[PDB]
Amino acid sequence: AEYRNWSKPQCDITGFAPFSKDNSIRLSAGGDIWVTREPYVSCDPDKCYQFALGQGTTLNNVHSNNTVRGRTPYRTLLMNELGVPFHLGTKQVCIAWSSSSCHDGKAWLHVCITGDDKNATASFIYNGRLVDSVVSWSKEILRTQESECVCINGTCTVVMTDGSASGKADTKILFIEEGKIVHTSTLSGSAQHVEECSCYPRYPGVRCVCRDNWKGSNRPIVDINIKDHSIVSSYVCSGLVGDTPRKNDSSSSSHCLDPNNEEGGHGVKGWAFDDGNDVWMGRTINETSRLGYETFKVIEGWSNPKSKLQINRQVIVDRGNRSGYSGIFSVEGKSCINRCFYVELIRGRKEETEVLWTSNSIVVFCGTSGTYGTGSWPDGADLNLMPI
Amino acid sequence: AEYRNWSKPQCDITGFAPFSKDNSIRLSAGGDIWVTREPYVSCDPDKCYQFALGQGTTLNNVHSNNTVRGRTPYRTLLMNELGVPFHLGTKQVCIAWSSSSCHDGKAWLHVCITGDDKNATASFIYNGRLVDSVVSWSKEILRTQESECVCINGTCTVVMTDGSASGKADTKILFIEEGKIVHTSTLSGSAQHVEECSCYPRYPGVRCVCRDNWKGSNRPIVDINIKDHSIVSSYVCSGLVGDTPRKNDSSSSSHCLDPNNEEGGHGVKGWAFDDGNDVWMGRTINETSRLGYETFKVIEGWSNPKSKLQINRQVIVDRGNRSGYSGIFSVEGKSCINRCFYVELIRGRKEETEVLWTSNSIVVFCGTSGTYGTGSWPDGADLNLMPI
Amino acid sequence: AEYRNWSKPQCDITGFAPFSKDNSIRLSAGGDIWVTREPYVSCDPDKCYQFALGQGTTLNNVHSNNTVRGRTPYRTLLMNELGVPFHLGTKQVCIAWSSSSCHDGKAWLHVCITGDDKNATASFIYNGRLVDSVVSWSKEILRTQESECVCINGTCTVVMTDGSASGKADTKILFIEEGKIVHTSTLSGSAQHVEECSCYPRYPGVRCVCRDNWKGSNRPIVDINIKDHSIVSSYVCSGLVGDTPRKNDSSSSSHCLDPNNEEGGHGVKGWAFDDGNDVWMGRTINETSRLGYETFKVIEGWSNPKSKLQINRQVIVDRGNRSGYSGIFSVEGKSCINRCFYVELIRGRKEETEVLWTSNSIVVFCGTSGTYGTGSWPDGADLNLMPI
Amino acid sequence: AEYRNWSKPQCDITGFAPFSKDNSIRLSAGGDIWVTREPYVSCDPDKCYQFALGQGTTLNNVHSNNTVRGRTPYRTLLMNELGVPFHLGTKQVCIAWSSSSCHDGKAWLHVCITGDDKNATASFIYNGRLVDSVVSWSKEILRTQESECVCINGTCTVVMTDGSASGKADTKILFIEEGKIVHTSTLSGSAQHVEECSCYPRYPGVRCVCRDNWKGSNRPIVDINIKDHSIVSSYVCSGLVGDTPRKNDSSSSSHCLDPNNEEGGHGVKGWAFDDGNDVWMGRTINETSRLGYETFKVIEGWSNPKSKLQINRQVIVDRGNRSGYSGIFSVEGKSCINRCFYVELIRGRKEETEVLWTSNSIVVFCGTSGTYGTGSWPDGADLNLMPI
Ligand SMILES: *[C@@H]1O[C@H](CO)[C@@H](O[C@@H]2O[C@H](CO)[C@@H](O[C@@H]3O[C@H](CO[C@H]4O[C@H](CO)[C@@H](O)[C@H](O)[C@@H]4O)[C@@H](O)[C@H](O[C@H]4O[C@H](CO)[C@@H](O)[C@H](O)[C@@H]4O)[C@@H]3O)[C@H](O)[C@H]2NC(C)=O)[C@H](O)[C@H]1NC(C)=O
Ligand SMILES: *[C@@H]1O[C@H](CO)[C@@H](O[C@@H]2O[C@H](CO)[C@@H](O[C@@H]3O[C@H](CO[C@H]4O[C@H](CO)[C@@H](O)[C@H](O)[C@@H]4O)[C@@H](O)[C@H](O[C@H]4O[C@H](CO)[C@@H](O)[C@H](O)[C@@H]4O)[C@@H]3O)[C@H](O)[C@H]2NC(C)=O)[C@H](O)[C@H]1NC(C)=O
Ligand SMILES: *[C@@H]1O[C@H](CO)[C@@H](O[C@@H]2O[C@H](CO)[C@@H](O[C@@H]3O[C@H](CO[C@H]4O[C@H](CO)[C@@H](O)[C@H](O)[C@@H]4O)[C@@H](O)[C@H](O[C@H]4O[C@H](CO)[C@@H](O)[C@H](O)[C@@H]4O)[C@@H]3O)[C@H](O)[C@H]2NC(C)=O)[C@H](O)[C@H]1NC(C)=O
Ligand SMILES: *[C@@H]1O[C@H](CO)[C@@H](O[C@@H]2O[C@H](CO)[C@@H](O[C@@H]3O[C@H](CO[C@H]4O[C@H](CO)[C@@H](O)[C@H](O)[C@@H]4O)[C@@H](O)[C@H](O[C@H]4O[C@H](CO)[C@@H](O)[C@H](O)[C@@H]4O)[C@@H]3O)[C@H](O)[C@H]2NC(C)=O)[C@H](O)[C@H]1NC(C)=O
Ligand SMILES: *[C@@H]1O[C@H](CO)[C@@H](O[C@@H]2O[C@H](CO)[C@@H](O)[C@H](O)[C@H]2NC(C)=O)[C@H](O)[C@H]1NC(C)=O
Ligand SMILES: *[C@@H]1O[C@H](CO[C@@H]2O[C@@H](C)[C@@H](O)[C@@H](O)[C@@H]2O)[C@@H](O)[C@H](O)[C@H]1NC(C)=O
Ligand SMILES: *[C@@H]1O[C@H](CO[C@@H]2O[C@@H](C)[C@@H](O)[C@@H](O)[C@@H]2O)[C@@H](O)[C@H](O)[C@H]1NC(C)=O
Ligand SMILES: *[C@@H]1O[C@H](CO[C@@H]2O[C@@H](C)[C@@H](O)[C@@H](O)[C@@H]2O)[C@@H](O)[C@H](O)[C@H]1NC(C)=O
Ligand SMILES: *[C@@H]1O[C@H](CO)[C@@H](O)[C@H](O)[C@H]1NC(C)=O
Ligand SMILES: *[C@@H]1O[C@H](CO)[C@@H](O)[C@H](O)[C@H]1NC(C)=O
Ligand SMILES: *[C@@H]1O[C@H](CO)[C@@H](O)[C@H](O)[C@H]1NC(C)=O
Ligand SMILES: *[C@@H]1O[C@H](CO)[C@@H](O)[C@H](O)[C@H]1NC(C)=O
Ligand SMILES: *[C@@H]1O[C@H](CO)[C@@H](O)[C@H](O)[C@H]1NC(C)=O
Ligand SMILES: *[C@@H]1O[C@H](CO)[C@@H](O)[C@H](O)[C@H]1NC(C)=O
Ligand SMILES: *[C@@H]1O[C@H](CO)[C@@H](O)[C@H](O)[C@H]1NC(C)=O
Ligand SMILES: [Ca+2]
Numbered sequence A, B, C, D: 001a002e003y004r005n006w007s008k009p010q011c012d013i014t015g016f017a018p019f020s021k022d023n024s025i026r027l028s029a030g031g032d033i034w035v036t037r038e039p040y041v042s043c044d045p046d047k048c049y050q051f052a053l054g055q056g057t058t059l060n061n062v063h064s065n066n067t068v069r070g071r072t073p074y075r076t077l078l079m080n081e082l083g084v085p086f087h088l089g090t091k092q093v094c095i096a097w098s099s100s101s102c103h104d105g106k107a108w109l110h111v112c113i114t115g116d117d118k119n120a121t122a123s124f125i126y127n128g129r130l131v132d133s134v135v136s137w138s139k140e141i142l143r144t145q146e147s148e149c150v151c152i153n154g155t156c157t158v159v160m161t162d163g164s165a166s167g168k169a170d171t172k173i174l175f176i177e178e179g180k181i182v183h184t185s186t187l188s189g190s191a192q193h194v195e196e197c198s199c200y201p202r203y204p205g206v207r208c209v210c211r212d213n214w215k216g217s218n219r220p221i222v223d224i225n226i227k228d229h230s231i232v233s234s235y236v237c238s239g240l241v242g243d244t245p246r247k248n249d250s251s252s253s254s255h256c257l258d259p260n261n262e263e264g265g266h267g268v269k270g271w272a273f274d275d276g277n278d279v280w281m282g283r284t285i286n287e288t289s290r291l292g293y294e295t296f297k298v299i300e301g302w303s304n305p306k307s308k309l310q311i312n313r314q315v316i317v318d319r320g321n322r323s324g325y326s327g328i329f330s331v332e333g334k335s336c337i338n339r340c341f342y343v344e345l346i347r348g349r350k351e352e353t354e355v356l357w358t359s360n361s362i363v364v365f366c367g368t369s370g371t372y373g374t375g376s377w378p379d380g381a382d383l384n385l386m387p388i
């Protein structure tokens, strides 16, 4: 086994094709399925695995009540092969209400945060063993990506924030080798608030596209230079913006360095990446809430804060169906690195009062250099008919 | 791991021996089992896998109501080892209301079609990743085999159809190397309508025996040449025809070039293969309905359209129980390529109104050069006793 | 991977140590467990597998009614790693209401029989593909061992019977190389009725201890020469006799060549093996019924038929508890071949009328050259409480 | 594949990081989970496994009543990958009401004990086959570690006891090569009563921290020389003692050689290990019943029976919640050997009478040389809302 260098060009992309659906909730009206949230996908060199933070309970289960809650000691990171839904034989790989995993070509790294809000613990687990742990530095909800980390030449990076959800917070980038935190750069550049980054390998370094929970409804970018541990940061220029909430298509605007100050509060995890001076991005369809899910290309949207020219729209989930978190992952082809993404399909509380639980299912698309059509692929469960 | 070439002669066949039964429905009365239809069987160099098209629901499950429906955004392609019923630990390999799959000696190809009726998308998945996709070309229910594809020297082939189900349609044959659509030949020859081909290797090409849904109760044949991509086609000469509905044995007739025009409309997926000038074929035992299942050799049935001389019959499913789709697969023996087939045993709606769902189980026989006896192997669930 | 030769001295045995137990019936009151009968154990070079004949149903399932029946089309051979109870992810490896399996060092052979009572088919499955089959020869319930077969230098041997359960039946021994029947030898020597042979390797031959459903309460021995395919047969001399029914310890007697004629009608599958001129053997504790199980050694039990001198008695299952079929299998130690055995633990109809089903769990013991104690390991379910 | 030698220095330990939690009781409220007690953790070179002792029943079952009982013939030793809950497809690896396991580099070894209280039997199962067995010597409950054994150069040591739980009793140390009992030295030194040892490699020997159930709330230490098979023994010096029950912190005293005589009756399985002349150790928070769980470092606590200076306290389970047995396991890193530990979270009878069953879940923590914070990880099920 050799370490992944990811030293290949990005695959040509014309949009994304259908790849996976798990049907989790539909399956839990007549099965034993875990209650989850903040799912994501990552792949070893052969195949892809789906992750989630469980709630330490199944759905048809009295312990399902009040699983809207985001941190409990009973939360663990679930790991299955992609498209094997989270059944009772599912492996909980570490204790965590916040997590990030990646495979460096030789083994899996997992980053797992659990414990008190003010004194949380991050564990670093590699080749099935604990190798390290750092402590919460600002004492306010140590948290990480909720999607895959990236590993170049055996050096894996992960972005972590401790701090205010609504003011300056303390963001750091760790560099992990065979499970050991070898360096710790602190955030730099113009990004003013950073959360749940969707990172991808852009040789010779790593690029991430994040959530700004404070004053931006445009999206932070982070460059990460893997050799000298340096960081620069900014915002996704595209005048069509990827956070939720945000203003409508006619009003909005963006900046290449600063938060647009537009409904900037709150947000949703999301993803975008670059194709020359253009930008591929996904986002919710509804501008203020977590309904529907679209991707597209904005022409010159990577390098022009004034561009609002989308081509290649694809509806993933239609505006009548709930979406949620979403992130990126990278798959290595014979000739190129492909970009793929997942979409958390949230059901239940607080938005849906037909039940007492909160959970998700998931849908995964992958870039293609070929052709595709339309469709829609929601969660498809009926809550009025669900275990009451 | 070298590519499969299948460059061994077809095994001496005196008939078929019992190979596999999954018992899916009876089990789903006392366990959480997937609702499925359109199963098939394919096998890697070491062992055999069963596939099927899930309904994103288990049987004892409120979402099972209405699963008679062909295309939903929740249908996914399920894959287990042969004889492992579709339990909740079953992997979904892609989103699909129409698929095919083959292993090429090195890795699995899946051809998965999902999306809108008028704008379907086919994804091509190889060695664990999306490598390609085509849109619907005629915008009228893009569909493929519902059984194994075939790969020789690392080029795999699949047959797809877009367009009318009761008039001329647009059938193409795709050639695929490591998940990459490398050529697209268009259908040619006498065959006038084509659906759901059951293809076998037959060095140095591939042979398919399909379903004409338009004016044929005789079955289409499709020859595929692999090195130059040329396609010819015709019908199965035998005067005892393989489709359902059809005319009875005294009344029916056939042609080697055109459809026969006898109850030709509609159909069922089925299979045949040649042995010199003789034809082995399975079919249903009722003329108009998917009841029972039989197999036999029609002597000179591959090259004389008047021949109705059948020998070596066997009742696979007795005339009073339910059959359905049926297809071939080829298994590489020590000295020869053998031929086997599964039979979909469809139960429930709309033919059976004791329940609200529609599902299948399966039985599998394999070619034998040895000896054998008689029996019947239906689904054997009581729908009078099933889930509410 | 080399073939098994089994060419090592047989291990020293002082009695048997506990090895495995599946508590299947106990689990089936709070889980989905297969209904089975006629279980057995066979090991690959690395580890053991547990086998059984299914009823195409789990226990908490409406279809479990009249699982007393011994031949339906819904019966399959189930195969798990030893210890892993028959849950829904259990593989059904072939269609069988009578089976025998065994690993030759390179791959598994399975010998499965299904079909009509008067025309059944035995399928031979090797390295995951169908390689041969044979028709019933006497048209009267073709059956086989219901426990492991034995393979030497890549030649496997299995004993099958077809014919009357209460008169002269037609017993044959097959030699199967890589799934292919290379020879069929008919039964020879002095044994007058043969069924359900528990066979073990004994370099260079194979040897089997069987059941006489006809006139014997002593046990047929069959002896198979693997190179020149010769058969002899006789009975287990021991005045202590292993079949059930039988006369009591004081009243019973035996014979080295003929059936004792003492309560010979009916029987049970059991086992024995030589230890110089002595015999180790198991049997039900009760004379006329399938209650309790015991093993002991009988000094000069292999060669002198007047001997009734037992020693090293062990109670495996106490006399107030149900037992059943039992059979031998051999595990290869570093320097010698060990000998182990399984006791079927039958619960349900028609002996126990509290429930409508008929199922079993199992317990497994292995030869030791060490010291051991006492105990009793029954099935331990309470049927006064099981489903309905 | 070479034997494990464990010939690396012990890793720096500043404390413990969260590693795994299995949430077994909460899951059993809506899913089929085994009833277990006396769980523990051991790892092959690649990955860890959670073992436990099954009550031969799942939780939602009639057979779960009276699982408070310690020894029945339905108990088996369960084995899953760490973080995979004891679901229906979990392997039962041998019959055991008391057990121990280690991997020696090449394969697994299981020491399992079952049978009559006064004539128990212990089976030694190595690389999937029974290699040995010894009877109960003092005919008063042969029992063993209930946590991992330890192997060095392919020789495994395990500690067993036969005799009184409140008096002199007979402890022995077995030395096992590939499942073969090669030698047996008996207990020697000032250790007066020894049970349930939590052992760990300490090249070139093995050391163990045990339970004294007779006169000592300090914990026996046992040192095992692997080369001359010689045994010394004593007690953990630290003034804060590891047993439950015990006196409070201002009353407690120890002794390096003899039992303290302080509420010395009864006990709980627990662990400690040396770090220079300091000791690392865990224990229940509450001094007299199994409530809460804590770990800390005692400065000079390994060598000075007067030292009561603890540093680095961590609460694993808060004092409102239930703990139980806890043991140690060792994990080989690149440079050094890490120490880890599990905690049993016992729920139900006798202490809690809302339900009729007794079962557990586990939480697991690992040595770290990095940093950490606080938290509490109880079992977290609601027995009020549990199955009747
Ligand atoms: C089968 O499926 C295919 C593939 O998904 C569909 O083709 C896509 O259709 C979408 C939707 O129309 C296209 O996305 C849109 O592109 C527009 C640009 O289109 C033209 O204009 C420019 C500039 O003059 C030309 O250069 C270019 O060649 C085009 O002719 C954008 O304007 C769209 O954005 C606007 O529309 C959406 C609604 O669609 C609004 O909600 C937005 O806010 C915005 O106002 C959008 O980006 C996409 O490019 C097509 N892709 C491909 C590869 O063909 C087929 O339509 C479908 N077939 C059927 C029968 O449904
Ligand atoms: C035990 O199991 C074996 C194996 O399955 C059975 O043997 C098979 O039996 C079937 C059914 O009879 C045979 O198939 C039939 O072949 C007929 C050919 O007739 C003759 O063929 C030659 C010479 O002509 C002779 O060798 C032979 O003796 C025959 O007399 C076909 O005409 C049959 O088709 C017609 O009948 C069926 C109903 O049976 C109709 O439904 C058809 O539409 C059609 O009108 C039929 O195909 C088969 O060849 C046998 N195989 C072998 C290997 O022997 C035994 O039947 C079974 N035994 C018992 C006692 O149950
Ligand atoms: C702890 O566990 C061990 C191992 O299981 C037990 O020791 C075994 O005890 C059994 C039962 O008594 C023994 O089996 C019996 O052997 C007898 C041999 O006769 C004597 O001769 C030998 C050698 O000459 C002497 O060493 C010895 O003293 C014997 O007395 C047979 O005669 C017995 O058969 C009769 O008894 C049984 C039931 O008791 C009847 O059902 C039969 O029909 C028959 O009439 C019997 O076979 C066995 O050999 C012992 N094994 C070993 C290895 O020593 C301990 O008993 C047990 N301890 C406790 C307290 O339970
Ligand atoms: C975030 O997370 C970390 C990690 O858990 C916490 O830091 C630990 O805090 C605990 C609890 O206080 C510390 O353990 C305690 O250590 C005392 C040491 O005494 C002093 O002396 C040293 C130098 O000799 C100084 O460095 C230190 O500042 C101390 O003043 C022990 O004496 C304590 O034992 C007594 O208290 C406990 C209750 O705490 C009683 O139950 C005992 O019986 C006894 O009376 C105690 O064990 C631990 O050392 C810290 N570890 C580290 C690495 O710093 C943070 O507290 C936490 N932050 C927040 C805000 O929660
Ligand atoms: C269990 O099986 C028996 C036998 O199949 C069932 O009893 C038979 O039911 C049929 C149709 O209802 C009757 O015509 C017969 O008279 C019955 N036969 C016998 C031998 O009794 C019985 O109903 C089944 N039990 C359940 C609960 O379904
Ligand atoms: C569901 O839970 C509601 C809110 O309960 C709160 O959160 C839970 C997890 C507990 O910690 C509890 O003490 C809190 O009050 C309840 O009001 C409601 O009764 C529950 N519903 C059911 C059906 O149990
Ligand atoms: C079962 O469904 C019946 C009709 O189904 C209709 O079409 C499909 C696509 C469903 O999604 C459904 O919502 C539509 O109404 C219903 O009329 C009937 O009430 C249903 N029965 C039960 C028991 O739920
Ligand atoms: C639960 O069990 C109680 C105690 O009975 C004991 O345990 C069972 C398993 C048997 O071995 C019995 O002979 C023992 O005395 C019962 O007294 C009680 O009723 C049981 N409760 C229920 C609900 O079944
Ligand atoms: C967009 O939002 C603003 C609300 O601030 C509104 O004035 C404007 O008309 C909206 N435009 C459209 C096209 O919805
Ligand atoms: C956004 O979401 C809410 C959900 O209640 C809906 O009522 C509103 O109309 C949506 N608006 C748009 C423009 O999609
Ligand atoms: C077959 O059925 C049709 C009825 O439409 C008829 O042409 C013919 O007479 C039938 N043949 C036999 C043998 O019944
Ligand atoms: C075919 O099936 C139908 C439906 O029950 C039946 O009524 C009919 O008689 C069958 N036809 C023949 C020829 O057996
Ligand atoms: C054995 O059975 C016979 C009946 O044939 C009876 O007379 C005798 O008492 C029995 N002997 C023993 C030892 O049970
Ligand atoms: C067998 O059971 C019967 C009662 O059904 C009993 O009388 C007979 O003696 C039993 N044999 C033994 C050895 O217990
Ligand atoms: C410890 O636990 C016991 C058992 O319930 C309880 O009575 C007692 O109050 C506790 N003691 C302390 C000091 O917390
Ligand atoms: Ca925002």
Ligand SMILES: [Ca+2]
Residues within 6 Å of the ligand: none
């Ligand atoms: Ca259930």
Ligand SMILES: [Ca+2]
Residues within 6 Å of the ligand: B211, B212, B213, B214, B215, B216, B217, B243, B244, B245, B263, B264, B265, B266, B267, B268
């Ligand atoms: Ca047709």
Ligand SMILES: [Ca+2]
Residues within 6 Å of the ligand: C211, C212, C213, C214, C215, C216, C217, C243, C244, C245, C263, C264, C265, C266, C267, C268
């Ligand atoms: Ca008999």
Ligand SMILES: [Ca+2]
Residues within 6 Å of the ligand: D212, D213, D214, D215, D216, D217, D243, D244, D245, D263, D264, D265, D266, D267, D268
């Ligand atoms: Ca004590």
